[PDB]
């Protein structure tokens, strides 16, 4: 009927022009900040009662809290679409949305290159324990206590969750001379394996020299790598995570670093970020970044544009471009 609106939660950094352009189709509304309590008050107040679609992002969670069952339950009945900026969306309760008649899109295949770039950066950092020489040169110590690292050449990269990101990690890692193995719940068809060898979960733990993971976070993949799994890995394994930190029992990871079971880690993500377990943060043999995977100009703008294109498709045609696989 008349009077459709779109609501922006949080900020749009790179694609403001594309957002403003949607005003030819709908009334543009914004919730740039304010907290969950105030967001819920706005919902109950009727002011969003014409909103058919919502743009939100992983970062914008700080302004509303997650789009969990409770928040979805408060959304006005008008809402038909939530277009999310991020390849991960573990802060949206997808089934609650389905029940409320809301379709969700995310941003898959825009994050792949940048995240993989950071995964390989982290892997080489971890294999060289590069925080030591990075710190030493700046301190005027030259090498300082730098120790010899290991070459990735001839070594096995194991990938738990071979998907778009994993394939781009594998492509890079092969150029470094690595052999690639992976485990998904189901073997991928040959073009999607793109050269990698399928193995069981236990075999992935046993055979990886560098172990990396790309899983969606959920109640069952939380701590999928815990004490038991670390104990199955090779002595001297290096672990890389650019996915979600809570996939690993970080306290168990710290104990495994401490015993020498794990030689090093290359992390971009953490179980309670922005907090990092102290024994992890304080370990100069670890290679650690503060979740910078997609923090580039080209990737961030591509991610925004994908969300806005989903929105425009939803409004004009009543369909999404990248609807989440749960609903599809």
**If you write DSSP's letter for every residue of 88-105 in order, what string do you get?**
--TTB-HHHHHHTT-EEE
Q: How far apart are CA 295 and CA 287, in angstroms?
A: 18
The secondary structure of residue 120, as a DSSP letter, is: H
Q: Residues 243, 197, 249, 146: is their CA dihedral positive or negative?
A: negative
End-to-end CA distance of the chain: 26
Residue pair 55/32 in contact by the 8 Å Cβ criterion: no
Q: How far apart are CA 323 and CA 328, in angstroms?
A: 7
Q: How far apart are CA 328 and CA 325, in angstroms?
A: 5
- Delineate the domains of the chain, giving CATH numbers in brackets: 1-111+297-328 (3.40.50.720), 112-296 (3.40.50.720)
Query: Helix crossing, 164-175 with 112-127: angle to 10°?
Result: 50
Burial (CB < 10 A; 0-12, 13-18, 19+), residue 47, is: middle
Give the per-residue SS3 of 287-323.
EECCCCCCCCHHHHHHHHHHHHHHHHHHHHHCCCCCE
Residue pair 88/58 in contact by the 8 Å Cβ criterion: yes
Does an H or E element contain 284, and which? none
Burial 236-260 (b: 16+ CB within 10 A, else e): ebbbbbbbbbbbbbbebbbebbeee
DSSP 3-state of 170: helix
Cβ neighbours, 10 Å, residue 28:
15
Is 244 in the active site? yes
117 closest CA partner among 57, 74, 165, 61: 165
Cβ-Cβ contacts under 8 Å for 224 (sequence gap 6 or more): 160, 213, 215, 247, 248
Cβ-Cβ contacts under 8 Å for 250 (sequence gap 6 or more): 270, 271, 272, 276, 277, 280
Q: How far apart are CA 298 and CA 96, in angstroms?
A: 33
Query: Helix crossing, 297-317 with 112-127: angle to 10°?
Result: 150
Q: How far apart are CA 109 and CA 111, in angstroms?
A: 6
Which pair of structure tokens corresponds to residue 118?
């950071």
Is 291 in the active site? yes
Which experimental approach was used here?
X-ray
Q: How far apart are CA 81 and CA 294, in angstroms?
A: 24
Q: How far apart are CA 236 and CA 271, in angstroms?
A: 22
Q: What backbone torsions phi and psi does residue 198 show, to the nearest 5 degrees?
A: -75, 135
DSSP 3-state of 67: strand
Cβ-Cβ contacts under 8 Å for 186 (sequence gap 6 or more): none
Which pair of structure tokens corresponds to residue 189?
């068809």
Catalytic-labelled residue, pool 244, 271, 277, 312? 244
DSSP 3-state of 28: strand
β strands within the chain, DSSP E: 5-9, 27-31, 51-57, 81-85, 103-105, 156-160, 179-183, 197-198, 210-213, 237-241, 262-267, 287-288
Residue pair 118/128 in contact by the 8 Å Cβ criterion: no
Catalytic-labelled residue, pool 14, 171, 222, 291? 291
Structure resolution in Å?
1.8
């Amino acid at each position: 009927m008349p009077s459709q609106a779109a609501l922006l939660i949080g900020d749009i950094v790179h694609a403001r022009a594309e957002w403003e352009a949607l005003s030819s189709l709908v009334t543009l509304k914004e919730f740039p900040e304010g907290g969950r309590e105030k967001f819920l008050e706005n919902c109950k107040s009727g002011q969003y009662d014409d909103v058919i679609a919502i743009y939100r992002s992983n970062i914008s969670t700080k302004h509303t809290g997650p789009f969990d069952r409770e928040l979805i339950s408060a959304l006005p009945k008008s809402v038909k679409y939530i277009c999310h900026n991020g390849a991960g969306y573990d802060n949206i309760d997808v089934d609650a949305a389905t029940e409320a008649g809301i379709a969700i899109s995310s941003t898959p295949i825009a994050v792949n290159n940048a995240t993989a770039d950071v995964a390989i950066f982290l892997m080489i950092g971890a294999l060289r324990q590069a925080y030591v020489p990075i710190t030493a040169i700046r301190a005027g110590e030259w090498h300082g206590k730098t120790t010899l690292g290991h070459d990735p050449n001839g070594k096995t990269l194991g990938i738990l969750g071979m998907g778009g990101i994993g394939r781009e990690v594998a492509r890079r890692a092969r150029a470094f001379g690595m052999n690639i193995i992976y485990h998904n719940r189901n073997k991928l068809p040959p073009e999607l394996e793109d050269g990698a060898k399928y193995v069981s979960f236990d075999e992935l733990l046993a055979q990886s020299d560098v172990f990396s993971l790309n899983l969606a976070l959920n109640a069952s993949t939380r701590h999928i790598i815990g004490e038991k799994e670390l104990a199955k890995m090779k002595d001297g394994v290096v672990i890389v995570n650019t996915a979600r930190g809570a996939l690993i029992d970080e306290k168990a990871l710290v104990r495994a670093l401490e015993s020498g079971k794990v030689a090093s880690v290359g992390l971009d993500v953490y179980e309670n970020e922005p907090q990092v377990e102290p024994g992890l943060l304080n370990n100069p043999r670890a290679m650690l970044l503060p979740h910078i995977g997609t923090m580039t100009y080209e990737t961030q703008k591509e991610m925004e544009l994908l969300v806005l294109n989903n929105l425009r498709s939803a409004i004009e045609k009543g369909e999404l471009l990248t609807q989440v696989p749960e609903q599809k």
